[PDB]
Design a protein around this ligand. Structure first.
Ligand SMILES: NC(=O)C1=CN([C@@H]2O[C@H](COP(=O)(O)OP(=O)(O)OC[C@H]3O[C@@H](n4cnc5c(N)ncnc54)[C@H](OP(=O)(O)O)[C@@H]3O)[C@@H](O)[C@H]2O)C=CC1
Ligand SMILES: CCCCCCCCCCCC(=O)SCCNC(=O)CCNC(=O)[C@H](O)C(C)(C)COP(=O)(O)O
Ligand code: SF4
Ligand code: SF4
Ligand code: SF4
Lengths: 87, 157, 27, 385, 97, 316, 80, 157, 181, 140
């Protein structure tokens, strides 16, 4: 059978790895609920960087008026885990 | 508007009447003599003012006319003249030069001129970097025509 | 010198500049 | 919409012409010229030249109408210097300007005609062009880039016998114009290629800065020779042809008529040509005679100064325009008191005309684009500078 | 489409910066294809170079200077994408690979 | 630089890259050519006005040789040929000319640096007659000039190479690519630009390169099958390898070698089925561990994938 | 016999018919004129000494002006 | 080989005769020099009469005339057109701009000579060269083509 | 409509805060205005019955390095209705955007592109503001006085890359500056 | 009284009811200009020439007489100018450029360097008398 949404666990692992290997994120604060700005020492430019990295890894563009709400890993995974364009 | 004018317009359109005149006067030129010049046996007309290949001139004694005043180097719009100094170096980059004749106007002793030669195409760029000895050879080769042209043109300049 | 290139005494002959008609064709 | 990228890398259509067209089938939706392929930094170069050394740059802008740009630059320099030109020089300037206009119109008309497939008029017209190039060479020693018209007048006087040969040319030129016309004017194919092509309203022509034939084709009676006369144009009889439809056919007819009027002006200049000096007599701005410089100290000093430093122009700025064959050609000259122009902005009519190609060619066929380019009379030396 | 007015303050200028950075990053795959870089450099290195260029100017406090820098960056991106001049280890002004 | 270099054999593959690099360093380059004046035409754009000077010479004539060499203090020889013509044998093209050039350089007296370019597999006990002649030429040049420097590049890769281009042509014309030895021979192919850079570096040193032979191999070791795959990734085509055993390949490469020295007219050059190169494919040609590599010239060779094979874009 | 392959030389031989010999230079080039009016009375041309390998640069300076209508003086009068 | 050389020289003479008698230039009409080039092809000089026919496509061309200033923006277009020309091919540089940058030599936007982009066979000096000067340059090209010995060089290779 | 009438009538009718300087001279009538009033002044001159300045002849920049606002932008305009010319000028610096007049004069489009290319002055609301004369990827603004005459880079064919490429300039014979002052 | 067949200007259509159109436009203008302060010179200039033109149009019934007395082009061009003046009156209410600022400075220069007769010079000729009446009324 053919589906339309990526699995939640797969998206969680993918986003976790992307944040872990980014540039300035020690893979010890990276939890499935960790916030970019308050808990990862990332400025707004770096958070935009990470969100743009989320786009390449899942192969689709996230709307600008929607990226403003993806501030942690949980909100991210909530977004990509239900978006049909995700691959 | 009227049956006659409509009929005449129709006939002219159908019979291509206006296309005939173009055919006719194209055919008239067919039998007339041609204006082509049989180069290189025949040449186009030129004037004593023609601005061709530069040349350096000497007095009849054999002494060079140039006294290294550097006026031609100063006026040259293309900066194609390089002089060290009588000159010990006098270079004209024939590929920078715009063949304007300013240098000949500036020269106070009629030393540098643009002579009448226009047939000096080369196979290399370096042959178009004229040095002093080449310019003096040009002057020796074209001296009689250059002098005749100068005699002709001295009544205007 | 005192001789300059110019028109001859009386000027040059008149020249036409306008189109000439041509009524050629049996029509 | 598909995109056809058209660059003719040959003088069939300009040579550096580069067009991006959006098409709906064979219908043109948008024409976008890409220019700068002949941008040579002329305006920057001029700032490093004396006013005399800058003069040859103007021969190379609209390099089909050499002496007209020479004339415009000389006029701007004369205006800033308050320099008085002798009458004989004025007449020679106008005579050569109208010869140039004929040279330009012949080239423009017949290259357009060859573009739309009429081959013979090009050869016929270029023989007459060769005769006019001979007058350029007889006065300057150059067929094209004469650098003959200068601040203060002209470089040299006419050689003996030139006026007679020009008169001989004028006696036969009308028949040549008539032959070109009979080849083109009444031919149904020529009319089908040009009638209602590239229509321009008077409001559009004003909005897009059109000038010359591009403006007069739309019914606007405007010619700088009459609106802002210079040299001896106010002593001369000529008509200003204007169009009624504003299309390519009207502009073709206007160019033919302009050649006829130029012939008229040349005849008048030949008959009214006076004797006297061809250079302004102010001994601080004009070269002395060769014999004077070899005989008189003051003359030698002035010659040395003129050919090394050049003359100075008092600090000021002005815009000067002439009716060039392609339209209004203008120079915005800024002087700082020194011997070199501080700024020289060149206003080329082809720049305005080519900018208008988008609105002119809208909703026309692909084959009409070359027709519209030809009616604009674009030379990229002046467009790009 | 048209050239916008100058940013009134640093907040709106920062917003324009973020928009330019997004537009530059989203054009990376096109650049990789055009210059054939698959076996020469990773896309993230391009992203990193763009962000480093943005960071080296992080001390600017005048919104007009920021607007001009953004305009120049847009022009350079457009020339890189639309009118690519392929060299080998060099894209525009950056040593790649 | 005040170096005046006479580069023999500069109208071939490696010559253009070498002349470009020599002109970059400011050297004056003399380019002897044997045939049409259009053969060195592509070299004239390199360098400034007067810096690159092509000159007609004849190989089988000593006067012309010293004539083109009369103005130089550096001589680089690139002359060689991997096949045979009725006029020039393997030993004639790869040994006699090189020895003659070395002798003329000795009688010249002014040649500070002499560089002779050889092949990596050049040895006396080589299956390839061209490699045997190459080793003989190496010995002859060294005996005539003990201070000369020897380069031994591997199969070179580039826009005008004679390995990837023939493979692409054959594939696009037939649909399949043969493998002469089952696609198992190993070799370290090398970017041609790196070979040119190594020659320039040996010309630039403080004198340490004289008397020594350098083995210039690419960074990586491949099988002929492994290279055929870079060609297919790059030419965006579906691969289809066919095993041609050695005796069969030698059979299909036998006619030209047989009738080249018999028929009195020229033959087309071999692309894939050259007998000598097939013989060379029998053994593996690798850079020896005891030799001098791109290191000891302070150079790192470029990897093949990407830029060295970018010319393969033209075949898609 | 050079007329058959060289049509350029043939045109000169044809137009030499009825022409007047004006002079010969030091290289043996021959100079002819007609005194008519076809190309606006321009009827001066040179027959080069070498019927093959002729080249325009072989016209000496004394005759170059006459050939290009720069002057009405022939090469002989200039040399005297 | 007392008989092979004669036949080879005859073959080469035939090849050179064919290639000199049918030269099909493509014109790169960039600036003012293109106008003098147009005059060369016109009735007075009639390049047609020498067998010279101007072609629109580099694919049918044997020669490229670079007539005018070459800018940095245009250089890639010139090189690509040259690369589409089938062998044998020749390049004529016409005028000071194409030869060495001319009046624009010191500009920030101009290529200082087209021989930086393509190999040049003949340089025609002048600004612009007269139409007759271009014709002389084309006759020099014929002279260069007539030294070719393609068949002999290939026989010996 | 002579230059005395234009000067007097414009003094009487224009809003005072639009014009900082008014010159009457045979070299041309000249109005200087702040950048924020340029658009409105040009619209007034175009639309008003007694001026009818319908043709924008050109726009050009002039560089004055000794000035805090180094650039001066000059608008040359023509009234075919009254056979008169007017010059309107405003000053600008390297970072301050000025208003485009394309919506008033469509001919301004390319002249503004040229000012941006040559001098680096930007134009608000210009629909398509990119370089128009220089080579793609050009850096700098050549008509600035501090930009060197020969520029910074040149191009040549590179056989190993099989393409035309750009390198830093190298001059065989440098431009000689002759100082006659 | 004869209807005009062409204006001779491409894109400028004939307006056969040009008198009524002109009267309506001028009346609209004289109404809408009252939103400008009475002290502003723009308002006085517009009222002056608009009232003169309106009076001419009201008096003359034949458009040829209107064109002749005005000295200002065809009635179609007079309509273009009236519409443009109305448009300008709207933009000027919206811009509110009126009044004089507190620290208002303005440099006048009357440069009198002469220029030669032969250089291009615009010499249109005298305007219709109403232009000078408008100007002198503005000065007074
Ligand atoms: N894969 C490779 O390319 C490898 C090559 N080499 C060797 O390196 C050198 C350069 O290689 P490459 O550039 O590819 O070689 P090419 O075959 O491409 O070029 C050979 C050069 O030598 C000239 N030449 C050949 N035979 C003669 C002859 N009889 N007389 C005079 N000149 C002659 C050619 O002249 P012309 O053009 O006139 O025929 C040409 O200039 C050669 O020695 C080659 O064998 C080393 C290892 C591998
Ligand atoms: C192949 C590439 C093609 C495109 C290349 C384009 C190159 C463009 C080069 C110029 C780009 C710029 O500098 S664009 C101008 C950038 N300058 C500024 O933004 C100054 C203000 N500073 C800040 O906003 C913060 O310091 C900041 C850290 C930035 C974010 O804020 P945070 O701290 O809250 O994260
Ligand atoms: S002709 Fe003009 S550009 Fe050439 S060297 Fe003489 S003065 Fe200089
Ligand atoms: S102007 Fe005449 S005399 Fe002076 S340097 Fe030049 S050539 Fe010699
Ligand atoms: S060489 Fe002279 S005529 Fe030819 S394009 Fe350049 S400037 Fe124009």
């Amino acid at each position: 059978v053919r589906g339309s949404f990526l699995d939640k666990s797969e998206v969680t692992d993918r986003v976790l790895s992307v944040v872990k290997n980014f540039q300035k994120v020690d893979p010890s604060k990276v939890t499935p609920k960790a916030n970019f700005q308050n808990d990862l020492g990332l400025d707004s430019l770096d958070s935009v960087e990470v969100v743009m990295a989320l786009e390449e890894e899942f192969g689709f563009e996230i709307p600008d008026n929607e990226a403003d709400k993806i501030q942690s890993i949980d909100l991210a995974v909530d977004f990509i885990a239900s978006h049909p364009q995700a691959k | 508007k009227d049956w006659n004018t409509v009929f005449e317009r129709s006939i002219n359109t159908l019979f291509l009447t206006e296309m005939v005149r173009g055919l006719s006067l194209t055919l008239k030129y067919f039998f007339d003599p041609k204006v082509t010049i049989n180069y290189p046996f025949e040449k186009g007309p030129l004037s004593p003012r023609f601005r061709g290949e530069h040349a350096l001139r000497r007095y009849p004694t054999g002494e060079e006319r140039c006294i290294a005043c550097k006026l031609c180097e100063a006026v040259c719009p293309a900066q194609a003249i390089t002089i060290e100094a009588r000159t010990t170096r006098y270079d004209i980059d024939m590929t920078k030069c715009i063949y304007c004749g300013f240098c000949q106007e500036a020269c106070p002793v009629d030393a540098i001129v643009e002579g009448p030669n226009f047939e000096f195409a080369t196979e290399t760029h370096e042959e178009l970097l004229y040095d002093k000895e080449k310019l003096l050879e040009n002057g020796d080769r074209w001296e009689t025509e250059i002098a005749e042209n100068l005699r002709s043109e001295s009544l205007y300049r | 010198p005192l001789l300059q290139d110019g028109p001859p005494p009386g000027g040059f002959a008149p020249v036409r500049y306008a189109r000439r008609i041509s009524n050629t064709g049996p029509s | 919409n598909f995109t056809l990228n058209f660059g003719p890398q040959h003088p069939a259509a300009h040579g550096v012409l580069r067009l991006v067209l959006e098409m709906n089938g064979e219908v043109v939706e948008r024409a976008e010229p890409h220019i700068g392929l002949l941008h040579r930094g002329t305006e920057k170069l001029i700032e490093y030249k004396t006013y005399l050394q800058a003069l040859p740059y103007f021969d190379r802008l609209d390099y089909v109408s050499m002496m007209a740009q020479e004339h415009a630059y000389s006029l701007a320099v004369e205006k800033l210097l308050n320099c008085e030109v002798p009458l004989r020089a004025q007449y020679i300037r106008v005579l050569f300007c109208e010869i140039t206009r004929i040279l330009n119109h012949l080239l423009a008309l017949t290259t357009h005609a060859m573009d739309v497939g009429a081959l013979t008029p090009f050869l016929w017209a270029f023989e007459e062009r060769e005769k006019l190039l001979e007058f350029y060479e007889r006065v300057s020693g150059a067929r094209m880039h004469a650098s003959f018209i200068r601040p203060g007048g002209v470089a040299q006087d006419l050689p003996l016998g030139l006026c007679r040969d020009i008169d001989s040319f004028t006696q036969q030129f009308a028949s040549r114009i008539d032959e070109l016309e009979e080849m083109l004017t009444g031919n149904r194919i020529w009319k089908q290629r040009l009638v209602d092509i590239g229509t321009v309203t008077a409001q559009q022509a004003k909005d897009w800065g059109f000038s010359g034939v591009m403006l007069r084709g739309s019914g606007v009676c405007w010619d700088l020779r009459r609106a802002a006369p210079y040299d001896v144009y106010d002593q001369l009889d000529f008509d200003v042809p204007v169009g009624t439809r504003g299309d390519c056919y009207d502009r073709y007819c206007i160019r033919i008529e302009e050649m006829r009027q130029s012939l008229r002006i040349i005849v008048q200049c030949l008959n009214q040509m006076p004797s006297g000096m061809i250079k302004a007599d102010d001994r601080k701005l004009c070269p002395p005679s060769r014999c004077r410089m070899k005989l008189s100290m003051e003359s030698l000093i002035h010659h040395f100064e003129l050919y090394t430093e050049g003359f100075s122009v008092p600090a000021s700025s002005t815009y000067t325009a002439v009716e060039a064959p392609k339209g209004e050609f203008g120079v915005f000259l800024v002087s700082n008191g020194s011997n070199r122009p501080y700024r020289c902005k060149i206003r080329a009519p082809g720049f305005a005309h080519s900018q208008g190609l988008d609105f002119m060619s809208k909703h026309h066929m692909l084959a009409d684009v070359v027709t519209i380019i030809g009616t604009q009379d674009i030379v990229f030396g002046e467009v790009d500078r | 489409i048209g050239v916008p007015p100058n940013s009134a303050n640093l907040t709106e200028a920062r917003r324009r910066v973020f928009d330019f950075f997004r537009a530059a990053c989203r054009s990376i795959p096109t650049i990789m294809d055009i210059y054939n870089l698959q076996d020469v450099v990773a896309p993230s290195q391009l992203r990193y170079a763009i962000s480093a260029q943005i960071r080296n100017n992080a001390h600017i406090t005048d919104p007009k200077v920021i607007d001009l820098l953004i305009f120049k960056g847009m022009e350079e991106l457009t020339d890189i994408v639309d009118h690519a001049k392929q060299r080998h280890h060099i894209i525009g002004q950056y040593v790649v690979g | 630089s005040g170096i005046v270099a006479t580069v023999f054999g500069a109208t071939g593959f490696l010559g253009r890259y070498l002349v470009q690099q020599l002109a970059k360093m400011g050297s004056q380059v003399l380019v002897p050519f044997r045939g049409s004046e259009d053969s060195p035409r592509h070299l004239k754009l390199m360098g400034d006005l007067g810096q690159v000077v092509p000159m007609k010479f004849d190989p089988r004539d000593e006067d012309s040789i010293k004539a083109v060499m009369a103005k130089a203090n550096v001589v680089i020889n690139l002359i060689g040929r991997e096949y045979e013509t009725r006029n020039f044998s393997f030993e004639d093209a790869n040994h006699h000319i090189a020895e003659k050039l070395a002798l003329v350089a000795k009688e010249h007296g002014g040649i500070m640096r002499y560089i002779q370019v050889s092949c990596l597999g050049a040895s006396v006990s080589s299956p390839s007659r061209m490699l045997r002649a190459k080793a003989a030429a190496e010995e002859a040049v060294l005996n005539a000039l003990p201070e000369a420097t020897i380069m031994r590049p591997a199969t070179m890769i580039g826009t005008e190479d004679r390995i990837l281009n023939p493979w692409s042509m054959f594939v696009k014309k037939y649909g399949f690519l043969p493998l002469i030895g089952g696609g198992t021979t190993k070799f370290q192919p090398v970017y041609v630009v790196d070979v040119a850079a190594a020659i320039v570096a040996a010309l630039k040193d403080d004198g340490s390169s004289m008397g020594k032979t350098y083995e210039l191999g690419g960074p990586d070791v491949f099988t002929t099958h492994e290279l055929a795959e870079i060609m297919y990734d790059m030419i965006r085509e579906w691969p289809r390898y066919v095993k041609l055993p050695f005796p069969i390949a030698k059979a299909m490469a036998a006619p030209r070698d047989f009738m080249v020295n018999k028929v009195p007219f020229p033959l087309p050059s071999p692309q894939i089925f050259n007998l000598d190169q097939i013989n060379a494919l029998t053994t593996d040609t690798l850079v020896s561990d005891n030799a001098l590599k791109f290191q000891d010239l302070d150079l790192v060779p470029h990897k093949l994938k990407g830029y060295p094979v970018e010319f393969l874009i033209q075949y898609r | 016999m050079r007329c058959l392959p060289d049509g350029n030389l043939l045109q000169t031989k044809i137009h030499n018919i009825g022409a007047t010999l004006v002079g010969v230079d030091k290289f043996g080039n021959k100079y002819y004129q007609k005194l008519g009016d076809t190309q606006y009375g321009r009827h001066r041309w040179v027959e080069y000494a070498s019927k093959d390998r002729y080249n325009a640069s072989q016209v000496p300076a004394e005759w170059h002006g006459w050939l290009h209508f720069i002057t009405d003086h022939t090469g002989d009068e200039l040399l005297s | 080989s007392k008989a092979a050389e004669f036949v080879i020289s005859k073959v080469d003479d035939l090849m050179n005769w064919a290639r000199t008698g049918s030269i099909w230039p493509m014109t790169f009409g960039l600036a003012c020099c293109a106008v003098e080039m147009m005059h060369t092809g016109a009735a007075r000089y009639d390049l047609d009469r020498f067998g010279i026919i101007f072609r629109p496509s580099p694919r049918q061309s044997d020669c490229m005339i670079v007539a005018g200033t070459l800018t940095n923006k245009m250089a890639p277009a010139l090189r690509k057109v040259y690369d589409q020309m089938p062998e044998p091919r020749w390049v004529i540089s016409m005028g000071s701009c194409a030869n060495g940058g001319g009046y624009y030599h010191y500009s920030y936007s101009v290529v200082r000579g087209c021989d930086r982009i393509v190999p040049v066979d003949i340089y025609v000096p002048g600004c612009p060269p007269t139409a007759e000067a271009l014709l002389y340059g084309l006759l020099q090209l014929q002279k260069k083509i007539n030294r070719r010995k393609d068949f002999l060089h290939w026989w010996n290779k | 409509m002579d230059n005395q009438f234009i000067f007097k009538y414009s003094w009487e009718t224009l809003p005072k805060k639009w014009v900082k300087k008014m010159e009457r001279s045979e070299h041309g009538n000249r109005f200087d205005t702040n950048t924020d009033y340029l658009f409105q002044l040009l619209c007034f001159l175009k639309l008003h019955t007694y001026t009818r300045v319908q043709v924008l002849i050109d726009i050009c920049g002039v560089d004055y390095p000794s000035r805090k606002r180094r650039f001066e932008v000059v608008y040359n305009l023509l009234s075919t209705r009254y056979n008169s010319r007017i010059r309107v000028q405003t000053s600008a610096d390297e970072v301050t955007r000025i208003s485009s007049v394309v919506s008033l004069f469509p001919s301004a489009g390319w002249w503004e592109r040229e000012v941006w290319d040559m001098f680096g002055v930007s134009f608000i609301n210009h629909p398509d503001l990119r370089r128009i004369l220089t080579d793609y990827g050009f850096e700098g603004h050549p008509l600035r006085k501090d930009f060197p005459l020969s520029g910074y880079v040149q191009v040549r064919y590179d056989d190993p890359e099989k393409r035309v490429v750009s390198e830093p300039i190298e001059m065989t014979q440098e431009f000689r500056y002759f100082d006659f002052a | 009284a004869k209807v005009k067949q062409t204006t001779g200007i491409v894109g400028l259509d004939v307006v056969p009811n040009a008198r009524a159109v002109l009267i309506d436009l001028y009346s609209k203008t004289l109404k809408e200009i009252q939103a400008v302060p009475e002290d502003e010179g723009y308002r006085k200039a517009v009222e002056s020439f608009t009232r003169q033109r309106l009076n001419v149009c009201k008096e003359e019934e034949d458009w040829e007489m209107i064109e002749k007395r005005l000295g200002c082009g065809q009635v179609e061009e007079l309509i273009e100018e009236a519409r443009d003046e109305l448009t300008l009156i709207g933009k000027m209410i919206e811009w509110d450029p009126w009044g004089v600022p507190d620290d208002y400075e303005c440099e006048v220069i009357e440069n009198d360097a002469p220029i030669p007769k032969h250089v291009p010079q615009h010499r249109p000729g005298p305007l219709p008398e109403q232009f000078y009446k408008t100007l002198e009324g503005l000065i007074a």
